[PDB]
């Protein structure tokens, strides 16, 4: 719908859906910009991710309520309406999968792209495995798992252990451990290892960067505090 | 329950 | 769309909706058990005007972010996305009105009922007048007061001071004077004088009714408090 | 800016 759009105004108005808290717009605007073809740069990357990761969170945050009224409950009405949400909370992965596949990885040569792109994939698999039940399921959580490593292989190669995008990667691949793959001491082992070796890189950086680092080592820290 | 990057 | 469901079946779901806080999808829900043609209960009815409340009022805040945006830009891009958001939100304004009007208000026989949907009437009219700039917006103003004026003579003649929905009624036609008519002393007059008079009838409520009334009466003070 | 019935 958004092929009649100039890319630039695309992105503005990306931009503007965000002051509104228009997510839906926002991420519509955005996967207008990305089906231009071109490679995004640094700032609209962030675009893409904070659009659809509220829409997703709205989704998913409605799917827990119904969830647990479904729970609670074991008429048809609450597991059709859960399904209902289900169902939309899937569109909405499969399409920035979609895009991350078509064509933005293949193109990402840079860490901090191809990185980013990567935890985005894992990211999704593991919103899918979040309402996942079927025959599928193990493949779904295996998705997930295999984007989270590759992007984990390239970080540490390629970034300092301060770096946001490896931190915040480190960050979701241990949710991931805690909730999705049944290994607790994995998450604990990967937050602990993230957190203390960005300790030691943060005498490298500047005021601003230490506060970027240390505002999502802060998050590494609350999850081993509710862990442990 | 957990903090993912937000 | 929801030709095929189960009036009851629409309305627990609308519930369902609310609790997940997907009042976009609660307003269609309740949009559906509208048209099965059949009046609403008092319950009914506030889950109606809970469903398209919420959706609109995204709406109005969405448009005030970038009316404001605009306002200090004076490309095409801030007109067009407010002009977008514009359009969805009177969209939705003419979709309620349209239920109010068919057949919503004509099979409203008893003062609770009729009151409530006029003063919906005047609701939705008078977001209409907030956006509204064309030759049509003196009388979307007057609609707007036509609406609230019969739903107050229906209200002084049937309803005890203290009654929420003329409580709620007074309010936001209070509202509408200082906000659209330009008429702050009408405002102000209204809301003091509904206050007061709500004030004298107090003695006669239960403890549960009390607070029902008493609530309102302070976003009568809120007001006053702000204006004067 | 002013309160409506919320
Ligand atoms: C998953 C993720 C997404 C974005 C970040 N991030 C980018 N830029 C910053 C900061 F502003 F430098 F802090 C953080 C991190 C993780
Ligand atoms: C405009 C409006 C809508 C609903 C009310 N209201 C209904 N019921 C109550 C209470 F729970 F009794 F307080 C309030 C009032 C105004
Ligand atoms: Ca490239
Ligand atoms: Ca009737």
Known sequence: AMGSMERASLIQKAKLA???????????????????????????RNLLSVAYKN?????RAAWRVLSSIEQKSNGP??????????????????????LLDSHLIKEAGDAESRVFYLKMKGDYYRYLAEVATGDDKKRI???????????????????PPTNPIRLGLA?????????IANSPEEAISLAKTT??????????????????????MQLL???????? | RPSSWR
């Open chain 1, 171 to 179: 960050l979701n691949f241990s949710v991931f451990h805690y909730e």
């Open chain 1, 141 to 159: 959580i295996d998705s997930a798992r295999s984007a989270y490593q590759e992007a984990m292989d390239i970080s540490k190669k390629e970034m």
């Open chain 1, 55 to 59: 829409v997703v969170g709205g989704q």
């Open chain 1, 195 to 216: 957190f203390d070796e960005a300790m030691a890189d943060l005498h490298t950086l500047s005021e601003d960067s230490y506060k970027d680092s240390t505002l999502i």
């Open chain 1, 77 to 98: 009405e609450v597991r059709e309406y859960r399904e209902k949400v289900e169902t939309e909370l899937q569109g909405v992965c499969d399409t920035v999968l979609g």
């Open chain 1, 18 to 44: 965000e002051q509104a808290e228009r997510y839906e717009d926002m991420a519509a605007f955005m996967k207008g910009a990305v089906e231009k073809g071109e490679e995004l740069s640094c700032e609209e």
């Open chain 1, 221 to 228: 820290r609350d999850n081993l505090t509710l862990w442990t």
